[PDB]
Design a protein around this ligand. Sequence first.
Ligand code: FAD
Ligand code: BR
Ligand code: BR
Ligand code: BR
Ligand code: BR
Ligand code: BR
Ligand code: BR
Ligand code: BR
Ligand code: BR
Length: 217
Amino acid sequence: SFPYLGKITHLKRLNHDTREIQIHLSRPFNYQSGQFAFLKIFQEGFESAPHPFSISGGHGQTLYFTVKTSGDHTKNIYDNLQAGSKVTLDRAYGHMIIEEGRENQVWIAGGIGITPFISYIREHPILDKQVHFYYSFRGDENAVYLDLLRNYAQKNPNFELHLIDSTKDGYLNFEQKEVPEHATVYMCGPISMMKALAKQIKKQNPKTELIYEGWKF
Ligand SMILES: Cc1cc2nc3c(=O)[nH]c(=O)nc-3n(C[C@H](O)[C@H](O)[C@H](O)COP(=O)(O)OP(=O)(O)OC[C@H]3O[C@@H](n4cnc5c(N)ncnc54)[C@H](O)[C@@H]3O)c2cc1C
Ligand SMILES: [Br-]
Ligand SMILES: [Br-]
Ligand SMILES: [Br-]
Ligand SMILES: [Br-]
Ligand SMILES: [Br-]
Ligand SMILES: [Br-]
Ligand SMILES: [Br-]
Ligand SMILES: [Br-]
C-alpha cells in the first residue's frame, strides 16, 4: 500500500497549549478507537519527520488529532500550523482497542491521554457500554473537551464522568480501590502515571483486565 494524503480543513485551540487538527483524506481510512497514527506535516518551516498522535475522532475520509505542546514540533503546530497544508499518514497502530472490552468499563485519562477516549465518544453518539470515566488534568487551565464530555453524559446516562484536578487533589490514586472483574480498565496518559496506576490496580484487582497506552510527556 501507500500513504494517505490529507489536507488540514480545520484547526481549533482547545486551551493555552492544545490544538485540534481536522483532516480530509484522499481515501477512506480504517482505525479503532484507542489507536494512533504517525503524522508527517508538509508546510514551510515544519519538520516532515513523522510523529505519533492518537486518533481523536473521525470516520471515512475525516480524521482528527489533538496535539498538546510538549517540545519544538508540537509548539510549532500550536502557533503556526495552517489550514490547507497537507499531511501524510501510514496506517493505524496500537493494541488498545476500547470496543473489544467488556460491557462495563473504567476509563482513566491523564491530560492529553483523553484523546483515544474522545474518538470513542465521537464515534458512538449513543453509548453501548456502562462507563466510569476518570479524567485527571493539571489545573483547570489544562482541561480540554469539558463541554463535549458534559453533553455526552447528558445524552447517555450510562456515562459517568469524574473530573479530577490533580493540582487540588494530587495525582489520581487507585491504591486499594476495588474494580470488579466484570469490567475492563482502559488507561491513556503519561507513562509515569500509567505505571503507578497499573501497579495499584493489578495488586488490588489481579483478576481485572487492564489495558493502557502511555507516552513520555
Ligand atoms: C502512541 C503515542 C500516542 C501519542 N498520542 C499523542 C496525542 O494524542 N497527543 C499529543 O499531544 N501527543 C501524543 N503523543 C506524544 C507526541 O508524539 C510527542 O509529544 C511529540 O512527538 C513530541 O514532538 P516534539 O518535537 O514537540 O518534542 P520533542 O522535542 O521531540 O520531545 C521529546 C519527547 O517527545 C516524544 N517524542 C519525540 N519524538 C517522538 C517520536 N518520533 N516518537 C515518539 N515519541 C516522540 C518522547 O516522549 C520524547 O521524550 C503520543 C505518543 C505516542 C508514542
Ligand atoms: Br472503535
Ligand atoms: Br467525522
Ligand atoms: Br509521505
Ligand atoms: Br500495531
Ligand atoms: Br494536564
Ligand atoms: Br468541548
Ligand atoms: Br493524575
Ligand atoms: Br511521563
